[PDB]
């Protein structure tokens with residue numbers, strides 16, 4: 001889809017308001033939260049995997065965040 | 076045949092487009108790709124022979140690539 | 151071209167003689183020999199490279215043979 | 226000013242104490258030369274013509290077999306005889322077929338057999354050779370004046386065309402109003418035409434190596450044969466088939482035109498109709514600017530107003546060309562043209578169309594200038610009515626330096642050991658570099674002749690690996706350097 | 721510019737190296753290959769017994 | 770980029786990487802669309818019909 | 820007997836009706852009406868303007 | 869790549885400035901600077917008055933000026949002398965390698 005690749009980080013942004021800026025600033029976060037709520041099972045597996053591949057609290061948290069962010073994102 | 080002596084490497088090369096340059100730049104490599112796709116059995120045996128011949132890791136890969144290049148082009 | 155992908159290794163060979171079996175039995179080796187004769191410089195360099203890359207006389211000879219056979223065919 | 230609008234334009238800056246500069250010309254390329262007090266000139270090699278070509282060999286690419294005859298011998302009686310067998314326009318082959326009572330022999334064994342067919346050529350490719358004395362290069366010298374096209378003049382442009390032959394390799398171009406320029410060219414080194422063949426196949430021609438041409442596997446006449454009844458190597462274009470040892474037949478081996486086209490890859494194609502025009506050569510010349518002078522240096526600055534009749538445009542080479550027209554009193558006058566900063570307190574850019582002048586009032590003059598990287602302002606005219614134009618150049622100085630080094634390396638790869646003569650003004654460093662490059666290029670051509678670009682890359686990788694894993698630091702660095710160089714040459718080769 | 725790249729009959733002949741030629745002027749006759757048969761000698765009688 | 774009655778100001782490389790059927794700016798016949806496969810779906814659900 | 824044709828190959832062709840179209844720099848690609856037809860072999864390249 | 873559009877007739881009193889418009893497409897007139905204006909007196913071959921949008925031949929008066937904006941190219945005559953009364957044809961080398969001529973316009977001057 002064309003919608004899958006938005007015109008977001010292109011460096012053309014002025015002081016003038018961009019298209020669908022206000023509403024679309026939090027769409028990704030809302031979608032991720034809704035997906036996590038709908039599919040609680042996968043988040044537990046992601047947390048377990050992140051903890052398994054750890055060796056530092058910072059590492060595990062980053063791994064879990066990335067997994068949870070890209071699990072809904074990769075179609 | 077005459078097509079097997081292509082005049083590719085005979086010097087004499089100016090800054091002008093030669094005959095069948097873009098087409099013929101990768102045509103041999105593409106031929107080798109198709110041949111390896113059609114004949115995966117020989118590639119496995121060539122890898123085994125390269126591994127068993129030559130002790131250093133560099134040696135094995137050099138032998139494997141040389142054999143896989145000679146095989147299709149031996150005609 | 152088509153001439154670069156002959157029908158020699160197909161495995162469909164009966165007792166009947168094939169299209170240019172008599173002519174083409176030694177064409178490739180003759181062409182490699184002619185190439186070595188015409189372009190002696192690469193042969194010496196290939197010999198030196200094979201000697202450097204091979205720890206044993208078997209590795210050196212095999213590598214040199216492969217380099218010599220690939221150079222003309224690769225063109 | 227033809228050299229603008231061509232992507233291969235190259236700038237030669239400066240002359241030597243003697244007012245000469247060495248420049249290598251190429252067919253695709255173009256050269257713009259700028260000296261302190263000399264006008265800028267554009268040199269391009271447009272035509273290279275080889276004359277009076279002599280055919281050395283004709284090759285057959287599509288044969289034909291017509292009158293097949295055969296003779297058989299019974300076992301233990303030796304080989305049979307055909308009178309066509311010692312005819313040179315017949316291709317013959319001896320074999321053995323099973324013989325016996327059914328065959329009519331009376332002995333059981335292999336009986337000798339001979340078959341002959343008449344070889345006729347239907348299409349051939351003429352490999353011609355040209356004497357190096359018969360090359361006639363054609364060059365165009367256009368003074369980068371800024372003048373527009375004139376319909377009335379016999380020459381619409383003021384570009385002058387000079388022909389350089391190996392015997393008359395010194396010639397002077399008389400550029401009206403700009404003095405004269407002298408070219409001291411060296412045609413005999415541009416291409417070695419004693420190792421080249423002008424290979425003309427049916428409707429197309431190529432410039433190919435001569436040993437390559439003499440080592441082709443096709444039937445060939447010596448080139449002086451008008452009758453064409455003594456083809457050599459006839460067996461490369463026919464096949465003799467003896468299946469089951471029962472019969473023997475001989476058939477022609479099919480039109481070889483496509484196989485020849487595949488074998489011609491890597492050969493530069495050259496026109497060979499209505500003359501032998503090669504558009505791939507390069508020529509080395511020594512340009513003498515001593516008699517070359519600027520036009521209108523004894524003119525006064527224009528005091529009137531200028532209007533741009535052609536909006537400023539940026540060429541591919543990082544310079545700008547604009548077209549201005551004059552609305553002032555002084556008929557011929559120098560055009561005031563500067564590239565300054567916004568406050569006009571620094572000169573940032575340099576003019577390429579040196580000494581822009583306005584010969585006729587109703588005649589626009591178009592100026593090529595080289596603005597600096599970044600913001601700059603093109604000022605044209607004097608204060609009353611002066612026009613100031615802004616411009617931004619999108620590059621960077623480090624980027625231009627990298628691009629220039631790439632261009633120098635590329636010309637070294639193309640004109641190996643002759644690139645040193647592209648902008649040389651004499652000098653010890655240039656001569657030392659050229660000699661070292663000659664030695665190394667001789668070694669490289671010896672050790673890398675007749676090798677494809679993929680093989681070049683493979684050898685470069687192997688040599689770089691050997692250098693990397695080397696106990697000695699001197700050999701390690703030398704081998705790594707050789708590997709990097711041959712990797713670059715393999716990447717840039719076969720174009 | 722675009723060129724037609726000649727005729728590929730001879731290159732094809734070179735490519736067909738290693739293929740057993742056959743006949744197709746009439747009926748696609750093949751004169752190569754084997755055939756596996758079983759012999760039934762049971763009902764074979766010597767002619768001159 | 771002007772769509773139906775609304776226009777935007779977009780990045781050039783982003784616009785040339787749009788996954789839609791396109792014509793060149795000078796196409797002038799209007800029928801030779803390039804990546805038409807982005808705007809159609811081919812279905813062969815049971816390997817029975819397409 | 821009765822072999823069915825599987826694939827026809829071209830060994831000798833001929834090019835005709837050659838045509839060219841150009842665009843000024845930064846204006847995209849040119850358009851040739853012959854590009855719609857699939858029996859025309861076409862190629863896109865860039866030339867200095 | 870079709871015939872360019874020009875007004876059928878144009879008129880202007882002597883000494884006035886007269887403008888002719890040639891409207892093409894993104895390939896005829898808006899794509900390339902191959903805009904040339906031809907002046908043809910009746911019963912005579914056309915005369916190249918302007919080329920390259922603005923440039924004029926060596927023998928052409930300075931009263932002839934050309935401009936191009938978008939897909940439209942214009943020709944303006946200033947002195948508008950009686951000898952300027954003729955049919956003015958616009959042309960352009962289209963993107964397909966062909967030549968398109970405008971319908972032409974006529975100057976009455978008086």
Ligand SMILES: *[C@@H]1O[C@H](CO)[C@@H](O)[C@H](O)[C@H]1NC(C)=O
Nearest residue numbers: 290291292293294309315343
């Ligand atoms: C070859 O055959 C042709 C067939 O017409 C004949 O005219 C010609 O004389 C023959 N040439 C020989 C047998 O040398």
Ligand SMILES: *[C@@H]1O[C@H](CO)[C@@H](O)[C@H](O)[C@H]1NC(C)=O
Nearest residue numbers: 835836837838853856858859
């Ligand atoms: C191609 O050119 C021929 C003339 O040689 C003409 O008869 C034919 O109509 C043309 N076809 C196309 C598609 O341009």
